[PDB]
Design a protein around this ligand. Structure first.
Ligand SMILES: *C(=O)N1C[C@H](NOS(=O)(=O)O)CC[C@H]1C(N)=O
Ligand SMILES: [Br-]
Ligand SMILES: [Br-]
Ligand SMILES: [Br-]
Ligand code: NA
Length: 246
């Protein structure tokens, strides 16, 4: 990251909802970032579902995901969310956020190759301990909002240590809004409601391409009640609207 500046006026959107969280927003052409909370911007949290971004790239890189047209077939046995109980494309599995699909990808990648690529990607604390199929869900892997926007900028620029084609495949799978001169790539996450005195984390990360500008963003918040989950999009959306992005 280049320069980061704390803008405490963004806290207004947080205190209104009694949310403890951070937003990091970087405008590409100026190589500068802003945040409501410098300290929390660098604090590391479980990636949860945002890990589908590196996991998908690594699956393609290692050949575990054969190509972008691979279909992940449902074996017909119960899955934890009904929206996952179906065959899914790579983009579908990311968009509906089908954990079991990505757990099996991780198992087939294996510990050695997973470690190799998180080191290549400078992904968080790069600690994969806790089980190959769950280190990013309940294990020891942690990543900060600053690190997310660094990783996403590299993906946007096709500068990750992976093939350009594999980065491009995952990028189209991350498109969540498309208009003639407005394009959003993003991914949500939710680690859970945590435990007593130890809240879970909710994420929204991505980037916005508007005209010839691009804005990288990462949001996280403490969460111990699922009813608060939509704030992971509404707080950053209000901030980006106040900046004229949205
Ligand atoms: C990812 O964080 N998980 C899978 C799924 N993601 O949906 S979300 O991105 O809208 O948060 C549900 C939550 C979470 C999980 N239970 O693992
Ligand atoms: Br499941
Ligand atoms: Br996942
Ligand atoms: Br949401
Ligand atoms: Na955490």
């Amino acid at each position: 990251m280049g320069s980061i500046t704390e803008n405490t006026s963004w806290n207004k959107e947080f205190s209104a909802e009694a949310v403890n969280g951070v937003f990091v927003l970087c405008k590409s052409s100026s190589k500068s970032c802003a945040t409501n909370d410098l300290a929390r911007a660098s604090k590391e949290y479980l990636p949860a579902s945002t890990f589908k971004i590196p996991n998908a790239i690594i699956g393609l890189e290692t050949g575990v995901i054969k190509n972008e047209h691979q279909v992940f077939k449902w074996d017909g046995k119960p899955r934890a969310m009904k929206q996952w109980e179906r065959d899914l494309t790579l983009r579908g599995a990311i968009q509906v956020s089908a954990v079991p699909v990505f757990q099996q990808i991780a198992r087939e990648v294996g510990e050695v190759r997973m470690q190799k690529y998180l080191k290549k990607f400078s992904y968080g604390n790069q600690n994969i301990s806790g089980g190959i199929d769950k280190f990013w869900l309940e294990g020891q892997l942690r990543i900060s909002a600053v690190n997310q926007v660094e990783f996403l900028e590299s993906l946007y620029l096709n500068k990750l240590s992976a093939s350009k084609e594999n980065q491009l495949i995952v990028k189209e799978a991350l498109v969540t809004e498309a208009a003639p001169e407005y394009l959003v790539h993003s991914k949500t996450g939710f680690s859970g409601v945590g435990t007593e005195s130890n809240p879970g984390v909710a994420w929204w990360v991505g980037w916005v391409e508007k005209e010839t500008e691009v804005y990288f963003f990462a949001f996280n918040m403490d969460i111990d009640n699922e009813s608060k989950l939509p704030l992971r999009k509404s707080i950053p959306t209000k901030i980006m609207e106040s900046e004229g992005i949205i």
